[PDB]
Amino acid sequence: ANRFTSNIKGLTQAARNANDGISVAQTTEGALSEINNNLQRVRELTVQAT
Amino acid sequence: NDNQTITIDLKQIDAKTLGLDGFSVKN
Numbered sequence A: 001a002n003r004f005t006s007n008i009k010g011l012t013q014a015a016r017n018a019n020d021g022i023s024v025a026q027t028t029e030g031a032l033s034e035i036n037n038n039l040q041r042v043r044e045l046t047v048q049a050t
Numbered sequence B: 001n002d003n004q005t006i007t008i009d010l011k012q013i014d015a016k017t018l019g020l021d022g023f024s025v026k027n
Helices: A002-049
Strands: none
16 A cells, blocks of 8 residues: 555656646747747748849 | 749830931931
8 A cells, every 4th residue: 555655646746747748838839839920921021022 | 932933024215226316307
């Protein structure tokens, strides 16, 4: 039972760490969206400039 | 994309480039 308690507490804490990893990717992905939109407008401008 | 162009041509049209440079009908 004592070994089980370590796994129960360990896995529960591990799941909390996994939730943090999802947040990191979402925040990084969110910033990339505006970078994409800025690149899209720049491409349109070059078509009008050439 | 790039290099996607249609070329418009413009020719100099004036008296010099039409043969009418000095066109006179009197002495």
